[PDB]
């Protein structure tokens, strides 16, 4: 016979976890608490196998360059040695969900991709040509992530990522 109150911490946006090995939705959440429920019940990308990707995008934005939100868009990319993907992915999405980037509506979502010899984490934004936004995104990534300064970060438009070596 308890007597309880319950209220959850709202996020600036609703977000959707996606998965790919065809990209499929895992679920959508709107609160910090609901986020941990989804996150704590997913395998961490470090413990993932083969050629799989996690995606965490604003609700309504599909993690595909074709999506209208990703027109004229781009992404910062970090190539990581094996063993860093789980911690980096966590820090990135916690920073994204916490609105640490401070670029208005420019963020679309974050990806982590486990590959054969390395891992890749990326964050997408809407306007590739907005240098003030891409630099602020860059500056936040170096902070919220604990990567050495000489860690190379690459910014590419989505077209730069399609049909190229």
């Amino acid at each position: 016979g308890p007597h309880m109150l319950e209220a959850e911490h709202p996020l600036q946006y609703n977000y959707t976890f996606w998965y790919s090995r065809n990209i499929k939705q895992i679920g959508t959440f709107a609160s910090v608490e609901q986020f941990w429920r989804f996150y704590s019940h997913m395998v961490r990308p470090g413990d993932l196998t083969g050629h799989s990707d996690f995606h965490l995008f604003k609700e309504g934005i599909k993690p595909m360059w074709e999506d209208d939100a990703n027109k004229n868009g781009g992404k910062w990319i970090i190539r990581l040695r094996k063993g860093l993907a789980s911690r980096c992915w966590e820090n990135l999405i916690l920073a994204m969900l916490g609105e640490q980037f401070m670029v208005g509506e420019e963020i679309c979502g974050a990806v982590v991709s486990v590959r054969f010899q390395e891992d890749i984490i990326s964050i997408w934004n809407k306007t590739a040509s907005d240098q003030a936004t891409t630099a602020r995104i860059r500056d936040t990534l170096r902070r919220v992530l604990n990567l050495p300064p000489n860690t190379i970060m690459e910014y590419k438009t989505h077209t730069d990522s399609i049909k190229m070596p």
């Binding site: 600036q12 998965y19 895992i26 910090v32 997913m42 395998v43 993932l48 916490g98 640490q100």
Partner: protein, 34 residues
Amino acid sequence: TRIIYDRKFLMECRNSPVTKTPPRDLPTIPGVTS
């Protein structure tokens, strides 16, 4: 008036029984969703 959370706060929000159950809608994908 943007909603902003620092990392330490979000980490401490995990310490609640609300987080100890999966979402009902959670798909069962082998090797991904525990």
